[PDB]
A paper describes a structure:
To address this problem, we present a combined co-crystallization and peptide-soaking approach to obtain crystals for any 14-3-3σ–peptide complex that may exhibit difficulties when crystallizing under our optimized ‘sigma’ conditions. The second step involves, after these 14-3-3σ–cJun-pS227 crystals are fully grown, displacement of the c-Jun peptide via addition of the desired peptide for the final structure at high concentration to the crystal drop and incubation for a period of time until full occupancy of the peptide is achieved. We have found useful criteria to be using the peptide at >95% purity and performing the soaking at 277 K with an incubation time of one week. To demonstrate the experimental reliability of the method, we considered this approach for peptides found in the PDB where co-crystal structures were published with isoforms of 14-3-3 other than the sigma isoform, since they were not able to crystallize under the standard ‘sigma’ conditions or any of the other hundreds of screening conditions tested. Not only does this significantly reduce the production time, but new 14-3-3–peptide structures that were previously not accessible with the 14-3-3σ isoform, despite screening hundreds of other different conditions, were now also able to be resolved. The new strategy that we present here has allowed the determination of several new structures of 14-3-3σ which had not previously been possible, illustrating the ease and success of the method. All models were determined to belong to the orthorhombic space group C2221 using Zanuda. In addition, the method retains the robust, stable, high-resolution and well diffracting features of crystals originally grown in the sigma screen.
The 14-3-3σ protein, which has multiple interacting partners with specific peptidic motifs, was used as a case study. We have observed this phenomenon first-hand with human 14-3-3σ, a protein which has several hundred known interacting partners in the cell. Furthermore, different isoforms of the 14-3-3 protein are function-specific. For example, the 14-3-3σ isoform (but not other isoforms) specifically targets p53 and is associated with tumour suppression, making it invaluable to determine crystal structures of the target peptide with the correct isoform.
Numbering used by the authors:
A (entry chain A), B (entry chain A): -3 to 70, 78 to 137, 139 to 231
C (entry chain P), D (entry chain P): 124 to 132
Write the structure that this text describes.
Amino acid sequence: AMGSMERASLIQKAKLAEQAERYEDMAAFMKGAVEKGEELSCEERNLLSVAYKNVVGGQRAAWRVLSSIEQKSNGPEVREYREKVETELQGVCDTVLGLLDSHLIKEAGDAESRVFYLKMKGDYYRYLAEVATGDKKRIIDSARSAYQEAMDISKKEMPPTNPIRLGLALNFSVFHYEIANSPEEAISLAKTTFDEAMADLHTLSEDSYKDSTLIMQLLRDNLTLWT
Amino acid sequence: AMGSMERASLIQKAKLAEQAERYEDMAAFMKGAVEKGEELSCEERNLLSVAYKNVVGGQRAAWRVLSSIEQKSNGPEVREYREKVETELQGVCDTVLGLLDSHLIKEAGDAESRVFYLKMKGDYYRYLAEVATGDKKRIIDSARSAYQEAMDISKKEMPPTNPIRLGLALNFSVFHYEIANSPEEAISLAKTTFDEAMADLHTLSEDSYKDSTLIMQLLRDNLTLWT
Amino acid sequence: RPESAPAES
Amino acid sequence: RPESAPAES
Ligand SMILES: [Ca+2]
Ligand SMILES: [Ca+2]
Ligand SMILES: [Cl-]
Ligand SMILES: [Cl-]
Ligand SMILES: [Cl-]
Ligand SMILES: [Cl-]
Ligand SMILES: [Cl-]
Ligand SMILES: [Cl-]
Ligand SMILES: [Cl-]
Ligand SMILES: [Cl-]
Ligand SMILES: [Mg+2]
Ligand SMILES: [Mg+2]
Ligand SMILES: [Mg+2]
Ligand SMILES: [Mg+2]
Ligand SMILES: [Mg+2]
Ligand SMILES: [Mg+2]
């Protein structure tokens, strides 16, 4: 329904929706912006991610509440309603993955854009994997493949403190721990990522230092949780 | 779309949606329950109110953010987007008012149900008044009339500590202060309501005492803000 | 800024 | 329970 609105107007309204905490609107505006067919800038990629991460985040939180009630339950209502939320979550993930495949990833040539999108692809397959049962293995391998491609590019093209590289490794480590039942791989990735970033902090300005150390703290928090 | 679901199932799913913090779903379930045509119980009235108050509350918060940006702005985008949120808010209020008029209020014979619904009618006209400009005066009088009818019943049929009576007077006082530009009426109503409740607390059990004093604290907080 | 009634009573 | 990356980078 966004086809008649100017790209610049969609971006402006996505920024307004973020300020208004209207994340479903924000996601619809950014979907419309992507469908204009132009590549996204750094700021626009962040808007897209913020919008859909907040939308899917509400769905994931709801699904976890309903799943817990359903598990303590074992009427059809809690299963039916969990299934409805689960279907809506899968629809949001499929929309995001569709935007990445048509055609954000294939047009992303720079490391910063390609790694961002491949991490996103891994993330939204990971959210699908969180609720998957029947075809879980193929969804898990799709997440792994996207994360792995992103990792290979980030190790060749970005410094170890680059915030996208750090956030990618953070999420791939969560994938290993929570999805792939590979806790030792999760811990090893988080530790190696943290240590290599630490040794690169000396190259950074004060503001880049703050950006990188914020994500490093998340790696440290998880390592503490896991060990 | 809820016509095919059992009333009991709609109520159960409204309770699940509340636990999942899915208030749009909760409102849709409770709208479906109301449209079954049976009167609502005390618990069901509370579900209806919780659902729509959280839905409209998100819209009001968004509208206030956008209005503030728009006022500091004086492109068409912020006005256009404020208007979109405003239209969606008006649609939610019209839905609630439609449920009250068809046919919750006319079938409400007991004081507890009739006062609850008439307060709700005042509340959702008040939310309409918050954004109204052209026809504001008729919307304001519709809120006043609903609140006044609710007040007259509550003073005849309920003790001064009854939580619905207290919440009604609280909201009518906010109406006077914020909507009707009658701050002295707001302060007088809040003070008289507080004092009459105070003198009735001795009749209450420990749990009713907690219910009434919670709303009395809101009256006291507002009096402090206003004086 | 003033507080209004909780949704539930 | 583990934390994942912020939406923005
Ligand atoms: Ca070990
Ligand atoms: Ca005076
Ligand atoms: Cl939203
Ligand atoms: Cl359902
Ligand atoms: Cl892939
Ligand atoms: Cl520990
Ligand atoms: Cl919602
Ligand atoms: Cl708009
Ligand atoms: Cl009326
Ligand atoms: Cl004061
Ligand atoms: Mg154009
Ligand atoms: Mg049942
Ligand atoms: Mg950062
Ligand atoms: Mg039936
Ligand atoms: Mg403009
Ligand atoms: Mg109470």
